[PDB]
Write a protein that binds this ligand. Structure first.
Ligand SMILES: *[C@@H]1O[C@H](CO[C@@H]2O[C@@H](C)[C@@H](O)[C@@H](O)[C@@H]2O)[C@@H](O[C@@H]2O[C@H](CO)[C@@H](O[C@@H]3O[C@H](CO[C@H]4O[C@H](CO)[C@@H](O)[C@H](O)[C@@H]4O[C@@H]4O[C@H](CO)[C@@H](O)[C@H](O)[C@H]4NC(C)=O)[C@@H](O)[C@H](O[C@H]4O[C@H](CO)[C@@H](O)[C@H](O)[C@@H]4O)[C@@H]3O)[C@H](O)[C@H]2NC(C)=O)[C@H](O)[C@H]1NC(C)=O
Ligand SMILES: *[C@@H]1O[C@H](CO)[C@@H](O[C@@H]2O[C@H](CO)[C@@H](O[C@@H]3O[C@H](CO[C@H]4O[C@H](CO)[C@@H](O)[C@H](O)[C@@H]4O[C@@H]4O[C@H](CO)[C@@H](O)[C@H](O)[C@H]4NC(C)=O)[C@@H](O)[C@H](O)[C@@H]3O)[C@H](O)[C@H]2NC(C)=O)[C@H](O)[C@H]1NC(C)=O
Ligand SMILES: *[C@@H]1O[C@H](CO)[C@@H](O[C@@H]2O[C@H](CO)[C@@H](O[C@@H]3O[C@H](CO)[C@@H](O)[C@H](O[C@H]4O[C@H](CO)[C@@H](O)[C@H](O)[C@@H]4O)[C@@H]3O)[C@H](O)[C@H]2NC(C)=O)[C@H](O)[C@H]1NC(C)=O
Ligand SMILES: *[C@@H]1O[C@H](CO)[C@@H](O[C@@H]2O[C@H](CO)[C@@H](O[C@@H]3O[C@H](CO)[C@@H](O)[C@H](O)[C@@H]3O)[C@H](O)[C@H]2NC(C)=O)[C@H](O)[C@H]1NC(C)=O
Ligand SMILES: *[C@@H]1O[C@H](CO)[C@@H](O[C@@H]2O[C@H](CO)[C@@H](O[C@@H]3O[C@H](CO)[C@@H](O)[C@H](O)[C@@H]3O)[C@H](O)[C@H]2NC(C)=O)[C@H](O)[C@H]1NC(C)=O
Ligand SMILES: *[C@@H]1O[C@H](CO)[C@@H](O[C@@H]2O[C@H](CO)[C@@H](O[C@@H]3O[C@H](CO)[C@@H](O)[C@H](O)[C@@H]3O)[C@H](O)[C@H]2NC(C)=O)[C@H](O)[C@H]1NC(C)=O
Ligand SMILES: *[C@@H]1O[C@H](CO)[C@@H](O[C@@H]2O[C@H](CO)[C@@H](O)[C@H](O)[C@H]2NC(C)=O)[C@H](O)[C@H]1NC(C)=O
Ligand SMILES: *[C@@H]1O[C@H](CO)[C@@H](O)[C@H](O)[C@H]1NC(C)=O
Ligand SMILES: [Zn+2]
Length: 608
């Protein structure tokens, strides 16, 4: 520990604690920058040298959070709740959280080693065909691509069986040990369990109830969608393997976790005679290039009179693919270095209509970072953890439209045909609405484990209960408590909350509606854009400047006017497809929901 990074002495006063907050701030951006700089380099190009620097940076960060966290508890754990500023209470409350650093070394060293071991066995999971094969598969590319692409039911089944079998089972012992150790650490931090810690972020005493009220508002839309897809699969696979009343076999939905079904959009799409618009042909013809694209993105924000990208951003960012042959993580990401001056993007840009849209949300994050850089570093995070991605997405929504592309000049004429825009809304539904029930059930399920209400003998039973209950899926081959299908997801062994994403996808439209309402727009909400609309920016800026200083429920209210989440706006946005599906289901007599829930298909005749 560098002494300039090691806390001093502070009184039990607020007057002292204000000085503690100030000192933590000044040290914090000096450590966090050094940490993120290393992590930036490692990700900007892989080298074992940079991986080492990455590893050392990780240790240096934890060592810093520890050295301050221990004193924050030692001096202010008896007090912090008392302090007059809700901003300061937020500052100290964040520092005062220690997480795993509560565990004594013996447990601590098991804990880290245990968490890493889960990630290893998941990331390095494998499936092998039932021969003396030279070669096995892995989740990507082999499994993701066979599962999404092929539709011979047996082959599709085996791929799903192998994965949840191989990825889950060897996790089963580890995840229990994690659950115990996880809760024990937070117990000392001040939470009943890890689950009550995660829910602590949304600072809502009624949080879990709020979700069910939201999800109940979605269920008519989701059931409408689910019931529609279910019929389509019946056309394809046969009467033996689908029940027009029952739930859907989990592996037919085109995705290993059935969390988003878009890979059956090719099979289901409405109005097969219409195209789906691709503006790439203009963009290449215009001589657009990656470097230019961001200036369009910046144009948008400047058009809202949000802040332009500072010169440092143009000096630093890796907008284009590198000139070297060096290996790089191409997946697009946006970075804030807690050093106030320089913000950074990595995009690996390929000039296509899709990545044009993608750049806008990635720059959206940068605009978000730019606005709250003025806060003390402890607060420089989204008003709540899903709130940051929402401000990212509302931007991509607007520009994805044909309406905005015409103001960009990339589109020649607007073509207001509902058959086309239904195609667009429906594919987006198969992407994101299918995700809401899944995103909801996981963190109910994990809360079930962390609260203990799912003891280890029920990990798998409570999982499939939650799947059929919410997502309308059932397992393709009988699954029993030796298996552990909850582990087969990325976010479970990586102990990463999904609930942020669900909260975000509701805040997304709850903003978009409140912006388009403010931007003077009227008409079909998916045809709104806010570009050039200074009225939207000035209100949007008020959200971004708040960062996390002000409780999100108060900030959201100041933007939208509602003290809480609501899915009515989301239903407004999807309204056109909502109506269309209701017609199509009514025409087919399709039974919404899934009675005969106690059904799942027989096995293929010679399996395998
Ligand atoms: C990615 O795309 C970027 C943008 O490209 C342009 O725009 C897009 C939409 C497409 O249409 C592209 O095809 C198009 O090229 C590229 O940056 C641009 O690169 C080109 C070529 O390298 C630049 O063109 C050259 O610019 C010189 C400077 O011209 C400006 O400054 C003069 C003073 O020096 C001034 O007198 C001019 O009026 C001009 O001012 C610009 O005005 C327009 C509006 O009228 C603004 O939009 C600009 O921002 C203004 N820029 C400034 C600095 O004020 C010219 O001297 C030069 O002409 C000479 O060279 C050409 C060959 O290049 C000869 O053919 C010609 O005869 C003459 O001798 C030429 O115009 C362009 O300026 C760059 N953009 C900017 C903003 O500077 C990226 O390089 C590209 N990257 C990749 C990898 O593709
Ligand atoms: C969390 O902790 C950070 C870091 O300690 C605090 O930032 C510091 O806050 C104070 C108060 O806002 C700020 O002082 C003001 O800075 C303005 C710019 O001052 C710069 O120029 C003068 C000369 O004109 C220098 O004397 C200063 O040291 C500054 O120097 C420049 O700083 C930038 C930013 O880091 C750096 O990139 C440049 O390299 C450097 N210049 C050169 C030539 O190297 C003044 O206009 C104003 O009057 C005040 O002096 C101080 O500069 C901040 N430092 C940094 C590093 O950001 C945060 O305030 C704190 N958080 C909160 C919420 O308080
Ligand atoms: C990924 O990005 C990083 C940052 O841009 C980049 O880092 C540099 O990589 C090169 C090698 O490709 C390093 O060069 C050598 O590093 C070794 C130690 O690992 C040193 O022994 C070498 O010392 C000589 O060169 C010095 C100047 O670099 C001289 O001052 C010295 O006297 C010796 O003559 C040499 O430094 C370089 O150090 C790193 N730098 C950093 C900051 O990481 C890396 O190259 C990129 N990846 C790829 C594949 O290019
Ligand atoms: C932060 O506050 C602490 C507690 O008020 C200060 O700690 C004290 O620091 C002095 C030196 O400034 C230490 O002196 C040592 O005392 C022992 C005898 O106990 C002697 O053998 C050593 O040679 C040395 O003189 C003292 O131990 C230490 N006491 C405690 C309880 O921490 C500290 O000075 C303050 N920080 C700063 C930067 O001033
Ligand atoms: C994380 O997973 C790894 C791998 O499963 C665990 O490390 C393994 O630990 C065992 C002993 O605990 C090692 O087996 C022993 O090896 C020695 C020779 O080194 C041998 O004499 C013993 O009879 C026994 O076979 C095993 O080699 C070791 N594997 C690796 C790769 O290190 C680790 O304990 C797990 N940690 C947690 C927290 O789960
Ligand atoms: C939960 O369901 C699984 C199947 O999905 C059951 O596991 C399977 O049980 C049978 C009977 O023991 C195993 O067959 C045996 O395999 C061994 C080779 O491993 C072979 O030597 C025997 O002759 C016999 O064929 C089968 O392999 C096994 N599968 C797995 C993946 O373990 C399990 O029994 C069910 N749970 C409970 C509690 O019964
Ligand atoms: C910190 O907590 C204490 C205890 O809840 C508060 O002290 C009490 O304050 C009320 C009026 O605010 C008095 O009627 C009590 O007599 C006080 N009790 C004691 C033991 O002093 C204190 O006000 C809180 N501080 C803040 C800033 O809210
Ligand atoms: C598209 O045409 C319909 C015609 O009924 C109209 O109601 C709708 O508002 C048009 N789109 C926009 C963005 O105005
Ligand atoms: Zn994002």
């Amino acid at each position: 520990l560098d002494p300039g990074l090691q806390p001093g002495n502070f009184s039990a006063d607020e007057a002292g604690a204000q000085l503690f907050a100030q000192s933590y701030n000044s040290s914090a951006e000096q450590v966090l920058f050094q940490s993120v700089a290393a992590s930036w380099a490692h990700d900007t190009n892989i080298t074992a040298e940079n991986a080492r620097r990455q590893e050392e940076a990780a240790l240096l960060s934890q060592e810093f959070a520890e050295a301050w966290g221990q004193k924050a508890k030692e001096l202010y754990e008896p007090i912090w709740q008392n302090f007059t500023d809700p901003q300061l209470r937020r500052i100290i409350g964040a520092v005062r959280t220690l997480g795993s650093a509560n565990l004594p070394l013996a447990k601590r060293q098991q804990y880290n080693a245990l968490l890493s071991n889960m990630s290893r066995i998941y990331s390095t999971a494998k499936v092998c065909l039932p021969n003396k094969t030279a070669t096995c598969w892995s989740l990507d590319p082999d499994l993701t691509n066979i599962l999404a692409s092929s539709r011979s039911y047996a082959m599709l089944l085996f791929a799903w069986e192998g994965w949840h079998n191989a990825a889950g089972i060897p996790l089963k012992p580890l995840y229990e040990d994690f659950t115990a150790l996880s809760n024990e650490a937070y117990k000392q931090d001040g939470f009943t369990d890890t689950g009550a810690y995660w829910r602590s972020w949304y600072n809502s005493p009624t949080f879990e109830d709020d979700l069910e009220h939201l999800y109940q508002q979605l269920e008519p839309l989701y059931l409408n969608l689910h019931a529609f897809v279910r019929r389509a699969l019946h056309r394809r696979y046969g009467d033996r393997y689908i029940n027009l009343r029952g739930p859907i076999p989990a592996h037919l939905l085109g995705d290993m976790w059935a969390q988003s079904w878009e890979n059956i959009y090719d099979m289901v799409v409405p109005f097969p005679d219409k195209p789906n618009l691709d503006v790439t042909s203009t963009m290449l013809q215009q001589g657009w290039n990656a470097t230019h694209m961001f200036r369009v993105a910046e144009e948008f924000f400047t058009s809202l009179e949000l802040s332009p990208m500072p010169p440092e951003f143009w000096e630093g960012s890796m907008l284009e693919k590198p000139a070297d042959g060096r290996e790089v993580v191409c997946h697009a990401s946006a970075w804030d270095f807690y050093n106030r001056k320089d913000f950074r993007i990595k995009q690996c840009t390929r000039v296509t209509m899709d990545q044009l849209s993608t750049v806008h949300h990635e720059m959206g994050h940068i605009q978000y970072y730019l606005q709250y850089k003025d806060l003390p570093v402890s607060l420089r995070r989204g008003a709540n953890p899903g709130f940051h991605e929402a401000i990212g997405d509302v931007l991509a929504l607007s520009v994805s439209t044909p309406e905005h592309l015409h103001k960009i000049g990339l589109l020649d004429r607007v073509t207001n045909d509902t058959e086309s825009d239904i195609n667009y809304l429906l594919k987006m539904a198969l992407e994101k609405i299918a995700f809401l029930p899944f995103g909801y059930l996981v963190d109910q399920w994990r809360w079930g484990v962390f609260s203990g209400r799912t003891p280890p003998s029920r990990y798998n039973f409570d999982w499939w209960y939650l799947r059929t209950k919410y997502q309308g899926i059932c397992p393709p081959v009988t699954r029993n408590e030796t298996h552990f299908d909850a582990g087969a997801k990325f976010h479970v062994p990586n102990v990463t909350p999904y609930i942020r994403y669900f909260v975000s996808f509701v805040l997304q439209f709850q903003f978009h509606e409140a912006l388009c309402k403010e931007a003077g727009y009227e008409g079909p909400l998916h045809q709104c854009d806010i570009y050039r609309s200074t009225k939207a920016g000035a209100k949007l800026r008020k959200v971004l400047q708040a960062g996390s200083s002000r409780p999100w429920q108060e900030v959201l209210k100041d933007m939208v006017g509602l003290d809480a989440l609501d899915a009515q706006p989301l239903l407004k946005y999807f309204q056109l497809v909502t109506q269309w599906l209701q017609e199509q289901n009514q025409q087919n007599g399709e039974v919404l929901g899934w009675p005969e829930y106690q059904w799942h298909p027989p096995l293929p005749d010679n399996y395998p």
